[PDB]
Design an enzyme around this catalytic site. Structure first.
Site, PDB file in Angstrom:
ATOM      1  N   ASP A   1      15.952   3.583  13.348  1.00  0.00           N
ATOM      2  CA  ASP A   1      16.051   3.531  14.819  1.00  0.00           C
ATOM      3  C   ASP A   1      14.702   3.286  15.397  1.00  0.00           C
ATOM      4  O   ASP A   1      14.219   3.709  16.486  1.00  0.00           O
ATOM      5  CB  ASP A   1      16.791   4.614  15.364  1.00  0.00           C
ATOM      6  CG  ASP A   1      18.162   4.785  15.179  1.00  0.00           C
ATOM      7  OD1 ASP A   1      18.765   3.723  14.614  1.00  0.00           O
ATOM      8  OD2 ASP A   1      18.733   6.058  14.895  1.00  0.00           O
TER       9      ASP A   1
ATOM     10  N   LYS B   1       5.418   2.214   0.224  1.00  0.00           N
ATOM     11  CA  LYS B   1       7.008   1.958   0.671  1.00  0.00           C
ATOM     12  C   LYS B   1       7.229   2.695   1.728  1.00  0.00           C
ATOM     13  O   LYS B   1       6.830   3.682   2.088  1.00  0.00           O
ATOM     14  CB  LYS B   1       7.930   2.471  -0.441  1.00  0.00           C
ATOM     15  CG  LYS B   1       7.832   3.875  -0.912  1.00  0.00           C
ATOM     16  CD  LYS B   1       8.875   4.018  -2.167  1.00  0.00           C
ATOM     17  CE  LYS B   1       8.676   5.476  -2.647  1.00  0.00           C
ATOM     18  NZ  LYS B   1       9.342   5.669  -3.716  1.00  0.00           N
TER      19      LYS B   1
ATOM     20  N   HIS C   1       0.877  -1.328  -0.142  1.00  0.00           N
ATOM     21  CA  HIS C   1      -0.050   0.092  -0.017  1.00  0.00           C
ATOM     22  C   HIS C   1       0.686   1.348  -0.026  1.00  0.00           C
ATOM     23  O   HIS C   1       0.366   2.261  -0.492  1.00  0.00           O
ATOM     24  CB  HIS C   1      -0.942  -0.001   1.305  1.00  0.00           C
ATOM     25  CG  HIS C   1      -1.890  -1.073   1.415  1.00  0.00           C
ATOM     26  ND1 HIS C   1      -3.081  -1.271   0.446  1.00  0.00           N
ATOM     27  CD2 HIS C   1      -1.810  -2.173   1.852  1.00  0.00           C
ATOM     28  CE1 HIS C   1      -3.678  -2.039   0.562  1.00  0.00           C
ATOM     29  NE2 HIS C   1      -3.093  -2.874   1.574  1.00  0.00           N
TER      30      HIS C   1
END
Length: 151
Positions: free
Chosen positions: A90, A85, A83
Site C-alpha cells: 500500500d 530485496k 542491494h
C-alpha cells in the site's frame, strides 16, 4: 538462523494479510511457500500485485514465482544485482495511482531484507516511515518501467 528467518517470514505474512490495495515485490529469488500463499490470498482479496525478479532464478527449484505468474501476477525481469530485496504494501503513490485508474484507509509498509542468491529472510526490516516507503515505492516504479514480462 532458521528460527530468526521463520519469525521474520511470519511477521511479513501478517503484513501481507493486512494489505488493502497493493503489493509491489522486488526479490532476487522467491522460495518461501508461506510468503507466496499469503500473496496468493491477497490476490484473492482483490489486492493488486506486481513482482520484479531475476531471470536466472525464476526456473530454479522451489521457485514459487512460477505459480504466482500463472494466477495473473505480472512478473517483470531485467535479463539478466540488488542491494536488498524489498516489498512495498500500500505505497502512497501506488494507491493513489490505483485510485485514479479505478475511481478505504491504509498505511504504507516496506519490508526489506538481504538478497539471498539461494524461505530465507534474515536482516529483515519492517517499517512505515513514509520517507522510506516513498523512496522504495518510487524505486519500484522506476524498475517496473525500466525487460522481459513473463507470459
Amino acid at each position: 538462523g532458521p528460527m530468526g528467518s521463520l519469525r521474520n517470514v511470519a511477521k511479513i505474512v501478517e503484513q501481507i494479510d493486512r494489505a488493502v490495495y497493493s503489493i509491489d515485490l522486488a526479490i532476487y529469488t522467491f522460495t518461501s511457500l508461506f510468503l507466496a500463499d499469503s500473496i496468493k490470498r491477497a490476490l484473492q482479496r482483490g489486492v493488486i500485485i506486481r513482482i520484479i525478479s531475476d531471470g536466472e532464478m525464476v526456473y530454479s527449484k522451489g521457485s514459487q514465482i512460477s505459480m504466482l505468474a500463472q494466477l495473473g501476477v505480472p512478473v517483470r525481469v531485467p535479463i539478466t544485482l540488488m542491494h536488498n530485496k524489498f516489498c512495498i504494501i500500500d505505497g502512497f503513490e501506488r494507491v493513489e495511482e490505483i485510485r485514479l485508474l479505478r475511481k478505504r484507509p491504509c498505511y504504507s509498509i516496506v519490508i526489506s531484507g538481504s538478497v539471498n542468491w539461494t524461505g530465507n529472510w534474515e536482516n529483515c526490516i519492517i517499517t512505515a516511515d513514509d520517507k522510506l516507503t516513498a523512496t522504495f515505492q518510487a524505486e519500484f516504479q522506476r524498475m517496473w518501467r525500466a525487460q522481459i514480462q513473463l507470459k
